[PDB]
Design a protein around this ligand. Sequence first.
Ligand SMILES: Nc1ncnc2c1ncn2[C@@H]1O[C@H](COP(=O)(O)OP(=O)(O)OP(=O)(O)O)[C@@H](O)[C@H]1O
Lengths: 723, 538
Amino acid sequence: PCYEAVLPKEKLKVEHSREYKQERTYTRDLLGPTVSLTQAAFTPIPVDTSQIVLPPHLERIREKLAENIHELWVMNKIELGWQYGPVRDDNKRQHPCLVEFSKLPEQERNYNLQMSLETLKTLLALGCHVGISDEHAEDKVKKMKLPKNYQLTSGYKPAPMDLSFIKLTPSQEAMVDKLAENAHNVWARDRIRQGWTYGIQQDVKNRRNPRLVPYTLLDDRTKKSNKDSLREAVRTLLGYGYNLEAPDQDHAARAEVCSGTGERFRIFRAEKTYAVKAGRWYFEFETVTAGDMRVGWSRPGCQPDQELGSDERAFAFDGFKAQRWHQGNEHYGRSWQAGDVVGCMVDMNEHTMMFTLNGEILLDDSGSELAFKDFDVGDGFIPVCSLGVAQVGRMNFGKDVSTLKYFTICGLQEGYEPFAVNTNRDITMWLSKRLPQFLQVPSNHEHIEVTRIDGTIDSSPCLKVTQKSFGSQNSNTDIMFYRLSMPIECAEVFSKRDDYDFLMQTSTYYYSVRIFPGQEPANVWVGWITSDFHQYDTGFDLDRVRTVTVTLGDEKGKVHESIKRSNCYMVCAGESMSPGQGRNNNGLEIGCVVDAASGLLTFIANGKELSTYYQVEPSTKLFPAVFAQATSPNVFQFELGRIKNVMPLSAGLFKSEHKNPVPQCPPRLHVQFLSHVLWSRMPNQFLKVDVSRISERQGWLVQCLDPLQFMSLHIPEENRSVD
Amino acid sequence: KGCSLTKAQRDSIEVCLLSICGQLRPSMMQHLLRRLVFDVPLLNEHAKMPLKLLTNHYERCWKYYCLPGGWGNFGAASEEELHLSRKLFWGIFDALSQKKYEQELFKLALPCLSAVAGALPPDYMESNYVSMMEKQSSMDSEGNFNPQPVDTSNITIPEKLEYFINKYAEHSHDKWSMDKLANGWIYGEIYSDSSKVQPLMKPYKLLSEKEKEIYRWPIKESLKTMLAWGWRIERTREGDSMALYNGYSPRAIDMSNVTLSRDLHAMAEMMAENYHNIWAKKKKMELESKGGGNHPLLVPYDTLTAKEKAKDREKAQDILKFLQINGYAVSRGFKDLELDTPSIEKRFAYSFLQQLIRYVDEAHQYILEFDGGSRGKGEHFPYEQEIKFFAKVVLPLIDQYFKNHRLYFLSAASRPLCSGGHASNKEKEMVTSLFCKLGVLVRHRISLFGNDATSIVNCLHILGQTLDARTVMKTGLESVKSALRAFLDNAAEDLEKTMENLKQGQFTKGVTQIINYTTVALLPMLSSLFEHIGQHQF
Ligand SMILES: Nc1ncnc2c1ncn2[C@@H]1O[C@H](COP(=O)(O)OP(=O)(O)OP(=O)(O)O)[C@@H](O)[C@H]1O
């Protein structure tokens, strides 16, 4: 059951899949990028210790230790009230483990031997060395007494050097914490080999165990029991004089770099149609948490992908760095804490911008009270705020004057007006779109440049994509995603000297891609994509293409046919020329033929038909696309030619040129690249859904009873809908 | 460096170089740093200009070296100039020490030492890489240049390298043969240079014996050039592929579109300066053959400019371009065995501070001798120049170094300078010990110091604010603890003497001398100690 997967100290709730719901705008919790939930899957990853060797004092001590420590646990169980007996079943209050070497079970014998080995072996595999204080510490063997009557009749006197004489360092405590969790990790791999898995309630028949959880998440009594036992063994270790020096706590901060998807910061701003040309305005930002946050005033040209304050378009302020941000970083102000409220006041007449933190107005390093001395009005300024990883904040534009926390004490007598002082409607929120979209390659784009080569009588029309920025300093070596705007539409119902009649009747379309010499073909991928493709990764391969196989059956259950779904269908050029002399003599030529009526994706390379092929559903958009990683200034080229008895791609794209064998490249067709920089518009209204568990009898209830509706402008060629 | 210049000419060139270098880029001038660290330690009359030039550079871009990231637009130190600057600072400091006291040179070099010390972070880990057989023999003292190559013929080339040589010799014949087929040289049995006809447009497997010597020579010595520096090569499998699938047919395969990584471009650059070295060496042999006529190309490789370098560097990396086109891969020959970051010895603070303690302990031995020397007739001791080197450089150098690195010696990984700048607790301990022994050095010799007593007083005074006395009481060596207690007892006896003099007469030649000694040294230092104890509640 699904309730069996909930984490122990966590409560199961039915919540919104998305972050933002219907609530009050000034209480709208703005969430930045989250942290990856990698720790949800519990994979025990302990340190390997077999590779190292252990010193001769360890060899001749691992037996005497093991003796003392196995007696050390028989001591604990006798204290708990244990009774020894010949039979094995501990449920019968009898078990043969209390007795000594020759007369305890030999498998437990060797188990104790090897666990002592791996303990003092991991003591060296954990980064700490150990060395005997002096030979006297081992030569002297004193024995403090434990009551023989309360101990069992076994002749050996149990108690060694007792619990006390050694001393505790926090280094030792942190050492034994991780040694105990490593012991649990070894136990966990043992249960994984047995096939055990985690479950809320322990089930031996179902291999369910609630104690198969990380060390910080275990149960306190058991973790502390094995803890006291383990470093009571460490008590014994320090008793025998083996002196250890702790490795220093190695400074290593992850700085919350790892985040949900690739987004590290999310920028929030008001609608561009609210910029203030002149006047004096007030605006507050509330910090629920303390983090790498930036609040200020942005120009309408602000790019969501760029960090706030790095350009002239942004005028922000950073908390922890105490950093005012505009075309660089210079010190200003103080760091905030959780619950701090920062009030931003802008004057558009004398070009002065100030901030107030918790009602007191900040000072920079200089004597100037204001942050940014002077600027140009330009096209206006709008409130803006960036949120870092695992950071939450609240934007209050002053829709209600009383909601502003510090406006009365500061900002009111000076006369700064709330940003929403005279607005009846709530201000629309615009934020960074997490999911990348495909847009036309801008001419000003420094990295990607596209040249349209007109097709001659002997040359097919060609679209060359070259990197002008390549060959220089600060360039980014990452895979780019390219595609053509016009799609190919498959037939709605699948049917079940070029010959001019065959060309007129056929529906097979063709385009070519030239892999320029010097460009690594393994970096380049050629094929078709659908509109659903919205995946951007630093490292792309054919194993990460999203696919699903819908198998439909009959009444008795036999799958009469199975259908495959995929947003991406490409091959790899590096594996495309296996023989060689497909690149060095002349650029690799990969051809893609698409059959609209049949639905087969076949790839032709240098006159040899590649074994890979794809079966596509009826009525599916297909966009020519090439995924390439830069290795040369000249990367690849879109040829629009046609092979023998195959209809050119322009006929498939444009319905007016349906019966035109001559290849065409109309101005509408152009190359688009995957780009993060875009804006998403928060709706002013959301569906109101209340969620509650009625009872244990009924379960969690969700209900929506009020309809909401929005107009959706559908772009035909892109197969995409906007608002 | 030239000697024909007048003093006015030598001043004008000084201002020109300083003005260019000031606004000039550090990535530019790191090239000049190599020949600077070889000439400045000599400490001749011509080093005056380099001293101030280096001072101004290291103060201009102090953040670039100090800040772990540096400026975003400017960048951060790549640690090879850091190693060079460490060698430079230590060489200047040592040789300056052995040199006799000249007031002008000393007051000109103290700011340089302070600037370089401030630029270098005290926690700097020197790279275990040292350089071999460098270019100082290339800019040797005799003739100001020597084109020494490495002994290539010592190296032997393996069988897979033979097989390389076969492939790349076929390819070189291809390049040679298209080049003159396009130029106008055409196939023909007759051999005429004027007629633009040669039989040499014919397949490599059949062509004459001539090319193998003059094709292998470039190749085989370019390969022994790998092996002298030892860079391991590998092969990809496409190379075995060409051989499996298998007068000449002219086919034009393109060359330049292939692009190369940064490390391999530097690789081609250094093997190219090897080519420049052999080239310039044989031009020099034919120059002593001619007797004279110093040709303009004899400037070193680093001095050599872009246009004269370009036709050379291109043919330099064409061989490696074909190397990883045809299916070969070259990697770095050497790997460092171990680099120790938690090591205490590699920290610049370590070597600097214990070398300073060695100097101050020597100075304490010298003041032990002066306990009877000042009682003796004259000061003229083997250490007059040595204690001068203290009194002008070392303690003022400590002043400048601490006013550059206030927070580093205060940050015990304990919140300030979050990016970096932690000074170890034991280094702090030995800092307190050097405080103690400097105090013992300065006690009761103020009259014996030649008006530099007030200088050392305020040096120890600001050092008394750069002190931290928490580390000493959490963790300390018994001797350092005993030194601190001895300084407490010196302060205790001084305070008792002051209460006594206040006990007979408080209103204000032995007594006059000791009261002047008090008012000059004691009062500032008691005030520093007391304010430190009060502000840190010690
Ligand atoms: N060497 C040993 N000597 C004595 N008893 C042992 C020894 N090894 C295991 N046992 C007993 O077997 C039990 C096995 O405990 P373990 O740490 O493997 O997990 P468990 O939670 O008991 O098992 P499961 O995960 O199958 O529910 C111990 O609690 C102990 O009672």
